[PDB]
Structure formats: structure tokens, C-alpha cells
Design a protein around this ligand. Structure first.
Ligand SMILES: Cc1cc2nc3c(=O)[nH]c(=O)nc-3n(C[C@H](O)[C@H](O)[C@H](O)COP(=O)(O)OP(=O)(O)OC[C@H]3O[C@@H](n4cnc5c(N)ncnc54)[C@H](O)[C@@H]3O)c2cc1C
Ligand SMILES: NC(=O)c1ccc[n+]([C@@H]2O[C@H](COP(=O)([O-])OP(=O)(O)OC[C@H]3O[C@@H](n4cnc5c(N)ncnc54)[C@H](OP(=O)(O)O)[C@@H]3O)[C@@H](O)[C@H]2O)c1
Length: 378
């Protein structure tokens, strides 16, 4: 149930000279909103200027032109804030373009993409959009009013809140990796919509957002003495920053804290060691034990989080046999499965049991509520 609120801070987490960006934003919450560690912020993004301007150039329109679809009048530039502009082209979109195409070979090409293999390999695997194909085919006679009606409604993007409400219940932070690269479609440079939107926000800007609690619970154990193992390289650190803040307040309120291991991984401490100072300070203060893995250090082997976990396997498996909860956040496509595989291998090795037994062990851990994931694909 979306609300509109102000940005209180917006800044760069990576170091000067990094070729990449990760943003930290703080966002104010109204009275009616609240959150918990492990919650998500749903952000309704705006489409960036460059992509809007590509649409208006292609159709020969002024951004400010007032129009009415068939029922209020609204500007072209504002209508373009309601739709997705870089989803893969759909078959309905392709058929629509083909019907409006007056150069025969260009119509053959569009219709070729409807076929099973071409669509899979040339549209979906490359993320080729309707807009890119309209730019390739300036003579395709689709109208603006038809373009806009064929597109999907703009979707929320989700971010793992990276603060604890025990610090300030009405302010939440998020930690955003800025997606950009050469477009897989081959049409210039790609910018992820919500991450570049958030990247451009500044203090004082307004944002429309909502609190969303995930289906799979991602929360601290009830007892602060229960041990924790947290694996969150890169932007996967985000929810665990929240857990670090909650533990810090629990300690300042007199509670006694158990062991908490944070496995953090990034390219280099000279580039993308997010929240390094706060995390080094939490460690000094006994809130966590920090284990870092640097993947791109001159004169050192490439080290990932799971390589350190495997060295620490006896200790991690001992903590788990004592009741620890295990948490993975960040990349779900390659990192999370490898971290899972390493944990299970450590169990098999420590307890001299088979891999099927290790998988059943992990399955039971999940069923007890002690193996949680906040992961996403990228
Ligand atoms: C539960 C959950 C929690 C999350 N937590 C966080 C978080 O804490 N921090 C964070 O940064 N993200 C998080 N995400 C991811 C986030 O919601 C967005 O998906 C991410 O910011 C990308 O959105 P976007 O709008 O910028 O890019 P979009 O415009 O939506 O594009 C993203 C898509 O573009 C594809 N793509 C990437 N590069 C290229 C390229 N060069 N050419 C063509 N296509 C490309 C991607 O593979 C993906 O399919 C989370 C996601 C989920 C589901
Ligand atoms: O992904 C992008 C950036 O996200 P991010 O900046 O948060 O993360 P990331 O920076 O891409 O990676 C975070 C750390 O995880 C490492 N990593 C890459 N593959 C891994 C794997 N299979 N197992 C364990 N760790 C691995 C990276 O090392 P390398 O990149 O050096 O291999 C880096 O050191 C999206 O924004 C697009």
C-alpha cells in the first residue's frame, strides 16, 4: 500500500575510482508504516530521462505534449512513467510491429522472431525490447498510442532493508547495486531502471515505496545468545547490516550476545568493501566476527566466501550442531548454490556421512526455521 515520502540521504558506498556503483539511501517512514529486520522496501521507480527521450525521438513527439488515450489529458513524458520500457519484446508486440511494417524484408525478420528457437535465443536470451526494434525499424508505422497500450505496467523493485528499526523505527536504509553494462541486445549501453533511478535521487527528493515482509522469514533468532552464521558478499551484506544494528542495540540494552560470524566478500578493500568501517567497528565491539574474502587483489589468490567457509568448516558445523541459524543473502544464481554446496560438504566431512545425509541434514535445518535465504538473481 504505497506511500510517498522523502529521501533523507543518498550516497556512494564504493571508493573513488571504482568502475561500479552501490548506493546507500535513507528513507523516512510515516506514522502508519513500520518495519523489522529482514523486511524489503518495494520501490515504484521512474524511467530515466535517456530512455524516455528515446521514445519521444522515435515517435517525433515533444515530451510535454498533452494527450488523451481511449480518459484524462496527461503529458507524453508522464504517460511513459507508467509502463515498462525494456522488457523483452512479446509475441503480441512483434505481431503488432509486423502488421505495421511496409518494408518487406523487415517484416520477414520480425515474423522470424516469433518462431520458437529465434524467440528463445534472439529475444529472450538477449533481452531485445520493442523500443530497440522500433529504433531498428524507423519505417515501422506503429503509433505512440498503440506502443503505450501494448506495454506492461511499471513494476515495483524490492530492496533488503539494511537498517534495524531499533535504531530509529521511522527511518529505513537500502543498499543498491547500480546495474549498468553494454546491453545484451547489442543496442548501446544498458541501465537497470530502478537502480539508476535510486542512484539519481538526492536528499530532499520524494519516493513512492512500501514495506514488504518476505514469504520466507529472515529474522534474528529470538534469543540473542543463539549463534548465527551470515553469508552475504557484495550487496548481499545488506540485511545483515540491519542484524548488526539490532545486535548492537540489544547489547547496549544489557543483553548478552552469542557468536555471530559474518562472511563478507568483495573485489578489493580499495574498491567495494561496503560499510567496512561500521563492520570493523561492530567486530571491535564484539557484535560479530568478520571474515572477508577478496576476489581481485594483486598477488593473492581469488578468494570467495565459500573458500573461507570451507577452511572454517569444523567450527561452522559445531555451531550449527549447537543450535546456530544460518543465513545467505545476495546472489541466488551462482553464489548461494555454491555456499550451500560447501556447507553440505563440510557437514559430510565433519560427520563422516554421505552427501544424501548432508542434504537431508540441510532439509531438516530449513524445516526447523534455521536456514534462511534472502537471495535474488542478477
Ligand atoms: C527479494 C529481493 C531482494 C532484493 N534485495 C536487493 C538489494 O538489497 N540490493 C539490490 O541492489 N538489489 C536487490 N534486489 C534486486 C532488485 O530488486 C532489482 O531487481 C535490481 O535493482 C535490478 O532492477 P532494475 O530496475 O535496476 O533493473 P531492470 O531494468 O529491472 O533490469 C534487470 C534485468 O536486466 C538484466 N540485465 C542486467 N544487465 C544487463 C545488460 N547489460 N543488458 C541487458 N539486460 C541486463 C538482469 O539480468 C535482470 O534480468 C532484490 C531482489 C529481490 C527479488
Ligand atoms: O551482480 C551485479 C553486482 O552485484 P554486487 O556488486 O553486489 O556483487 P558482485 O560485486 O558481483 O560480487 C560480490 C563478490 O562476490 C564474488 N563472487 C562472484 N561469483 C561468486 C561465486 N560464484 N561465489 C562466491 N562469490 C562470488 C565477486 O567476485 P568476482 O566478481 O571477482 O569473481 C565479488 O568478490 C548486479 O548488480 C548486476
Amino acid at each position: 500500500g504505497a506511500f510517498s515520502t522523502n529521501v533523507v540521504a543518498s550516497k556512494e558506498l564504493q571508493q573513488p575510482g571504482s568502475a561500479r556503483s552501490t548506493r546507500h539511501l535513507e528513507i523516512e517512514l510515516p506514522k502508519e508504516a513500520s518495519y523489522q529486520e529482514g523486511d524489503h522496501l518495494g520501490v515504484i521507480p521512474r524511467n530515466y530521462e535517456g530512455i524516455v527521450n528515446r521514445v519521444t525521438a522515435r515517435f517525433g513527439l515533444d515530451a510535454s505534449q498533452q494527450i488523451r488515450l481511449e480518459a484524462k489529458t496527461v503529458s507524453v513524458e508522464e504517460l511513459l512513467q507508467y509502463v515498462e520500457l525494456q522488457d523483452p519484446v512479446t509475441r503480441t508486440q512483434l505481431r503488432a510491429m509486423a502488421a505495421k511494417t511496409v518494408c518487406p524484408p523487415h517484416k520477414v525478420e520480425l515474423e522470424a522472431l516469433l518462431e520458437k528457437q529465434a524467440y528463445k535465443e534472439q529475444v529472450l536470451a538477449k533481452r531485445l525490447t520493442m523500443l530497440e526494434l522500433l529504433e531498428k525499424y524507423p519505417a515501422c508505422e506503429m503509433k505512440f498510442s498503440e506502443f503505450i497500450a501494448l506495454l506492461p505496467s511499471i513494476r515495483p523493485r524490492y530492496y533488503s532493508i539494511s537498517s534495524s528499526p531499533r535504531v530509529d523505527e521511522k527511518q529505513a536504509s537500502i543498499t543498491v547495486s547500480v546495474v549498468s553494462g553494454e546491453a545484451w541486445s547489442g543496442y548501446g549501453e544498458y541501465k537497470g531502471i530502478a537502480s539508476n533511478y535510486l542512484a539519481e535521487l538526492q536528499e530532499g527528493d520524494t519516493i513512492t515505496c512500501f514495506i514488504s515482509t518476505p514469504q520466507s522469514e529472515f529474522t534474528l533468532p529470538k534469543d540473542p545468545e543463539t549463534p548465527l552464521i551470515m553469508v552475504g558478499p557484495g550487496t548481499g551484506v545488506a540485511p545483515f547490516r540491519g542484524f548488526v544494528q539490532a545486535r548492537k542495540q540489544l547489547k547496549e540494552q544489557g543483553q548478552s550476545l552469542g557468536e555471530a560470524h559474518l562472511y563478507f566478500g568483495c573485489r578489493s578493500p580499495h574498491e567495494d568493501y561496503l560499510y567496512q568501517e561500521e563492520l570493523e567497528n561492530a567486530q571491535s565491539e564484539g557484535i560479530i566476527t568478520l571474515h572477508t574474502a577478496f576476489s581481485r587483489m594483486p598477488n593473492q589468490p581469488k578468494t570467495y566466501v565459500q573458500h573461507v567457509m570451507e577452511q572454517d568448516g569444523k567450527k561452522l558445523i559445531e555451531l550449527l550442531d549447537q543450535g546456530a541459524h544460518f543465513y545467505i543473502c545476495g546472489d541466488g544464481s551462482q553464489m548461494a548454490p555454491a555456499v550451500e554446496a560447501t556447507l553440505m560438504k563440510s557437514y559430510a566431512d565433519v560427520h563422516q556421512v554421505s552427501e544424501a545425509d548432508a542434504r537431508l541434514w540441510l532439509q531438516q535445518l530449513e524445516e526447523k526455521g534455521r536456514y534462511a535465504k534472502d537471495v535474488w538473481a542478477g
